[PDB]
Amino acid sequence: NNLTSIDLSPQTLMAMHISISSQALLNQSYSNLLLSQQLLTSQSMDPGLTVKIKAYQNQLRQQAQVFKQNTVAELIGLYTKASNFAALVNAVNALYSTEDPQVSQKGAEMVAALSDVAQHYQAAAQAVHTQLQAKREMLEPLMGNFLNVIDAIEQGLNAEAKQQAQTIAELNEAIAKNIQSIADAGFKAGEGVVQLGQSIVAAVPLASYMISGIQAISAGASGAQQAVNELKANYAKLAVAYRALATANALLSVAKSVQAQAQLFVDTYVLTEQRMALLPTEWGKVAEAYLTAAPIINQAGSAAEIKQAKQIISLNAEKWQLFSKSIDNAKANYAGNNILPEVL
């Protein structure tokens, strides 16, 4: 109705871009893990299962490469649009720093213009989300069929081997939680520099399929020290379980190691897609607010009404600059987290 009711703020955009970065950065590291993982050779012995494992491994590696190189760039592109918008709000602020007597009209047209820009960023986000949802609809059936392959083999295992399979599944779920604790401590809700590494954590004899796993960098300064000690303990026990299950069915151990790497990639893809689902609607809310504000900013034309508009605009400009720094940080993480360095 009047100046006090307009919302020129970034609304939930800052928190949403942090929650997106949270999962997308981790999924960047899981992509590098799938790409670093030694390929299974045609050891044969059981060529049927080997083809099925290699097929899934190759299809996952191809999807990890598409996320690492294409999807990340597409997200960095969305974040750049948020930076751009922040600059435009800061331009509206720069306008009000002049003693133009017709500032109310020039200001209202600029806000009405940003309204249209927000509507475009809405469409830009919707495009990325459609791409993410399309792949998600392909990755779930792919993983589901591979899980049917594993389960079909497991129903025919002896008592001891079926238990080594349960133990592997349990530790893979435990190690996931450990990695999540470690990454969240490094991320500090968008203020930190998320950095994870990798190493050979286990091996299955055939001559030797060597399984890669995520590790913390700086086993001394990474927030959640509890999680690092659990991770080392869990990897040690995981290595035993694989060597054990391998005496019964070696390629089953390989298959479970591949599925564990996939579970992390597909689960974090799905979370990245669900955090992204809300972004179009939010840009839409910014577009709707800016459109409504325009006529109100125009009516504020008295010396005092202008001073009050300048005040509101300057406050929302500072809010957008704080979000613009949150974006620069996220963009620097995506850049620096492109490499998954080795650890000993």
Residue numbers in the entry: 2 to 207, 229 to 366
Q: How did the manuscript describe this experimental structure?
A:
Tripartite α-PFTs are members of the ClyA α-PFT family. Proteins in this family undergo a large scale conformational change from a compact soluble structure, where the hydrophobic residues are hidden often within a β-tongue motif, to an extended pore structure with the hydrophobic residues exposed in two extended α-helices which insert into the cell membrane. Here we show that S. marcescens has a tripartite haemolytic α-PFT (SmhABC), and propose a mechanism of pore assembly. We present the structures of the soluble A component (SmhA), as well as the soluble and pore conformations of the B component (SmhB).
SmhA folds into two distinct domains, a compact five helical bundle (α1, α2, α3, α6 and α7), and an associated head domain containing two helices (α4 and α5), and the β-tongue domain (two long anti-parallel β-strands, β1 and β2). In all monomers, there is missing density for approximately 20 residues between β1 and β2 (G208 – A229). Residues E192-V205 (β1 and loop to α3) and Y231-N250 (β2 and loop to α4) of the β-tongue domain are largely hydrophobic containing only polar uncharged and nonpolar residues, and are buried in the core of the protein, packing against α1, α3, α4, α5 (residues A272-Q283), and residues N351-E367 at the C-terminus. AhlB and SmhB use both a short β-strand and a short helix connected by a loop, while SmhA uses only a short loop perpendicular to β1. The second region is between the N-terminus and β-tongue, which includes a family conserved glutamine (Q38 SmhA, Q32 SmhB, Q45 NheA) on the N-terminal helix α1 that forms hydrogen bonds with the β-sheet backbone of the β-tongue. In addition, both SmhA and SmhB contain a family conserved (conserved in all but 1 sequence) lysine residue at the C-terminus (K333 in both SmhA and SmhB) that forms a hydrogen bond with a conserved hydroxyl (T81 SmhA; T78 SmhB) on helix α2. This would result in the pore form of SmhA having a similar extended helical structure to that of AhlB and SmhB.
